[PDB]
UniProtKB/Swiss-Prot annotation, chain A:
This is von Willebrand antigen 2. It comes from Homo sapiens (Human). Residues 26-79 form the TIL domain. The lineage of its organism: Eukaryota, Metazoa, Chordata, Craniata, Vertebrata.
Length: 83, 196, 82
């Protein structure tokens, strides 16, 4: 809690969970990042930008590649199609 | 060839350039029309966003964000707002005349807004298949306006506009069962005649 | 009572997931709620209700001592009966 409560005030902290030996729970493929953008570029997404000027929010998210596709992190190569 | 015209007749209906009325109740933000389509520079990115507008009512106040010349001018709630002025101000123009907000943006682009819901963008002879979105491609062919963002024609428009939402994680709309009577006129044959 | 799927956007309330965590946004009504995986309610609320609200999360004023004003309105020292 203390992490977020400071973060809300306008001053965020970084990497504190690295040595704390406690990470908040998240499903497979993701673990807790800090200050990920809400507009997670997913798999079946339109490539538009500079509308998501929202503030930055903490939470768990995929690795660098491994785009989101239906609640899991899957590699960008295997983005399916839909019909 | 003349100057075509999108439209939003009512809350959830859409008329294409080539002319194709179709039904699409949405609640997310959607790409009405743009230029960034396939193999193009992508000058303008007119968007539209409705809220509480799957069922038409006194709700469904629209929001419109139009993205041209690296600017951010948008409108809703009666007035227009400049969030980011664009570079070439010379082409910019606003004509608040009568009931409308006539709004030019260039040589071959113009927007009209009834202050309430309607969005009637007007494009010139310039493009001729250089755009895509919910209004189709502006090619003259009238039965290829449902070419989804994944580059295939779809038969069912409710799946189409789902392909054109911006936030790719919001709620896509629901395939409604087809009938001649909306919710109120459903099994309300009396009212159904008076409305008729 | 009817279990619905997710996401869900009726009546101006977008019920979405963000960063693997569930969100409920009421921006028209000026709030954002969410939950994490472990279960930790959080409410981001707009300054429009400055000095107005009163509930279990206290009033949105500046002070942090007076925000036990009961459903009648009574500054109660106890954080429990409140
Ligand atoms: C809160 O409202 C009360 C009653 O109207 C008023 O007396 C008081 O000055 C207000 N305080 C703040 C911090 O706005
Ligand atoms: Ca066409
Ligand atoms: Ca307080």
């Amino acid at each position: 809690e203390y992490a977020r409560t400071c973060a809300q005030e306008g001053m965020v902290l970084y990497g504190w969970t690295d040595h704390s030996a406690c990470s908040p729970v998240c499903p497979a493929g993701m673990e807790y990042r800090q200050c990920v953008s809400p507009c997670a570029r997913t798999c079946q997404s339109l490539h538009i930008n500079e509308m998501c000027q929202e503030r930055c929010v903490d939470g768990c998210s995929c690795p660098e590649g491994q785009l989101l596709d239906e609640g899991l992190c899957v590699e960008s190569t295997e983005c399916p199609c839909v019909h | 060839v003349c100057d075509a015209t999108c439209s939003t007749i009512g809350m959830a209906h859409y008329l294409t350039f080539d002319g194709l009325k179709y039904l699409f109740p949405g609640e997310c933000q959607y790409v009405l029309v743009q230029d960034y389509c396939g193999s193009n520079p992508g000058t303008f990115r007119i968007l539209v966003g409705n809220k509480g507008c799957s069922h038409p009512s006194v709700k469904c106040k629209k929001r419109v964000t139009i993205l041209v010349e690296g600017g951010e001018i948008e409108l809703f709630d009666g007035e227009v707002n400049v969030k980011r002025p664009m570079k070439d101000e010379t082409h910019f123009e606003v004509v608040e005349s009568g009931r409308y907000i006539i709004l030019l943006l260039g040589k071959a682009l113009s927007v009209v807004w009834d202050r309430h819901l309607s969005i009637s963008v007007v494009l010139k002879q310039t493009y001729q298949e250089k755009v895509c979105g919910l209004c189709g491609n502006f090619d003259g062919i009238q039965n290829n306006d449902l070419t989804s963002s994944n580059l295939q024609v779809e038969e069912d428009p409710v799946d189409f506009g789902n392909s054109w939402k911006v936030s790719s994680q919001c709620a896509d709309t629901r395939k409604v069962p087809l009938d001649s009577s909306p919710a109120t006129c459903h099994n309300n044959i009396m009212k159904q005649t008076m409305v008729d | 009572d009817q279990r619905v799927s997710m996401p869900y956007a009726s009546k101006g309330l977008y019920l979405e997931t963000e960063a693997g965590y569930y969100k409920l946004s009421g921006e028209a009504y000026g709030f954002v709620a969410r939950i994490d995986g472990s279960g930790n309610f959080q409410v981001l609320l707009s300054d429009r209700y400055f000095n107005k609200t009163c509930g279990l999360c206290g009033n949105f004023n500046i002070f942090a001592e007076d925000d036990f004003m009961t459903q009648e309105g009574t500054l109660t020292s106890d954080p429990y009966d409140f």
